[PDB]
A paper describes a structure:
Deubiquitinating enzymes (DUBs) cleave peptide- and isopeptide-bonds downstream of ubiquitin. By performing a comprehensive bioinformatical screen, followed by biochemical and structural characterization of interesting candidates, we were able to identify active members of this family in a wide range of eukaryotic species and a few host-associated bacteria. Due to the similarity to the herpesvirus proteins, we refer to this extended enzyme family as VTD (for Viral Tegument-like Deubiquitinases). While some VTD activities resemble viral tegument DUBs in that they favor K48-linked ubiquitin chains, other members are highly specific for K6- or K63-linked ubiquitin chains.
In order to gain insight into the functional differences of bacterial VTDs in comparison to their relatives from viruses and transposons, the structure of Wc-VTD1 was solved in the unbound form at 1.8 Å resolution as well as in a covalent complex with ubiquitin at 1.9 Å resolution. The latter was achieved by reacting the protease with ubiquitin-PA, which traps the Wc-VTD1 in an intermediate state with the ubiquitin being bound to the S1 site in a covalent linkage to the active cysteine. Helix α9 (residues 474 to 486) and its preceding loop (residues 469 to 476) are pushed about 9 Å toward the active site by ubiquitin’s loop consisting of residues 7 to 11, where it offers an interaction surface for the Ile-36 patch of the S1 ubiquitin. The β-hairpin turn consisting of residues 421 to 423 is pushed away by about 2 Å from the active site cleft by ubiquitin’s four very C-terminal residues. To compare the ubiquitin interaction of Wc-VTD1 to viral VTDs, a superposition of the bacterial protease with M48 was created, yielding an RMSD of 1.76 Å over 1113 atoms. Wc-VTD1 does not contain the ubiquitin-interacting β-hairpin of its viral relatives, but rather an irregular loop comprising residues 380–386 (colored yellow Fig. 5a). Three residues were chosen to investigate their importance for ubiquitin recognition, based on their structural position: Phe384 located on the P383/F384 loop and Ala392 on the adjacent β2 strand both contact the Ile44 patch, while Leu481 is part of the mobile α9 helix and contacts the Ile36 patch of ubiquitin. While the F384A and A392G mutants showed some residual activity, cleavage was completely abrogated by the L481A mutation, demonstrating the importance of the Ile36-patch recognition. Due to on the absence of a proximal ubiquitin in the Wc-VTD1~Ub-PA complex structure, the mechanism of the K6-specificty remains elusive.
Residue numbers in the entry:
A (entry chain A): 280 to 354, 360 to 493
B (entry chain B): 1 to 75
Write the structure that this text describes.
């Protein structure tokens, strides 16, 4: 019955996990669990309909993603994760006419080139839809699902203020705005290029089911 | 001889090198100037990511060439 359904992306623009108990792990940039969970999110969201994306589904991303994180710790890759574990396949995606790119490397850019990247990614000439981008800086990973209509689901395992995890439905302008808030331009006097690159560039991997 | 390294975030560094220098030697010189661990440096020249065991010469990198540096981001 409709009155018994959880709120979902079929009727709202932002859906939040209920589970917070993993947040010390997800928020720890000294670990790669945030990336594992972004890969689980791509796995699960690529073939979801909006009405399926409720708090319970995000909870499942966290629970199942932490299990695969643990399984990896005991004993084709993205940041050392085997994509087969997530039933994902990697697609070649880079800024070809750009001197920082090389065949087989992820798409490298800065905030100033994020919109251009999305323009290429959202072009079914370049990547089929749905397709997901797993996007990293030195201290955070997100997943951007490119949906059939060409709009986006942004999955953020950090959550607002580090608490929980959320998915937002975005058009292009909204996505750019959100990425500027999650990947903000960062500076302080004396900052070396190790931190300039770590905070102010990104790499993005394209994955599909 | 001098070569240049341009980082993705917009800085141009000058290095003093010899053609016999290995890519790993070059990465150590970059670490000396900007603190970047060599294992996280992607050095790009003519669209190839350079391998640590080869030399500048093996890649026909000559004086006043510019290499392009991307940080392998860990997430």
């Amino acid at each position: 019955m409709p009155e018994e359904e959880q709120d979902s992306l079929a009727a709202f623009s932002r859906i939040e996990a209920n589970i917070t108990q993993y947040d010390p792990l997800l928020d720890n940039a000294g670990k790669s669990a945030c990336t594992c969970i972004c890969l689980k999110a791509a796995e699960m969201l690529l073939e979801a309909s909006p009405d399926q994306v409720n708090a319970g589904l995000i909870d499942d991303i966290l629970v199942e993603g932490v299990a695969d994180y643990n399984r990896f710790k005991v004993g084709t890759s993205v940041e050392n994760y085997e994509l087969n574990t997530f039933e994902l396949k990697r697609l070649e995606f880079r800024d070809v006419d750009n001197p920082f790119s090389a065949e087989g490397n992820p798409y490298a850019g800065t905030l100033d080139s994020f919109a251009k990247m999305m323009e290429k990614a959202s072009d079914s000439k370049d990547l089929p839809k749905p397709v997901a981008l797993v996007m990293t800086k030195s201290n955070m990973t997100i997943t951007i699902v490119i949906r059939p209509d060409g709009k986006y689901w942004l999955f953020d395992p950090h959550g607002t203020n580090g608490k929980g995890a959320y998915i937002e439905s975005c058009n292009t302008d909204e996505l750019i705005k959100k990425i500027k808030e999650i990947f903000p331009k960062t500076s302080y006097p004396g900052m070396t290029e190790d931190e300039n690159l770590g905070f102010n560039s990104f790499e993005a991997y394209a994955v599909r089911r | 001889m001098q070569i240049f390294v341009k980082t993705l975030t917009g800085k141009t560094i000058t290095l003093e090198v010899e053609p016999s220098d290995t890519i790993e030697n070059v990465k150590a010189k970059i670490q000396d100037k900007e603190g970047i661990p060599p294992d996280q440096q992607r050095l790009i020249f003519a669209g190839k990511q350079l391998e640590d065991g080869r030399t500048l010469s093996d890649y026909n990198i000559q004086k006043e060439s510019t290499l392009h540096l991307v940080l392998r981001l860990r997430g």
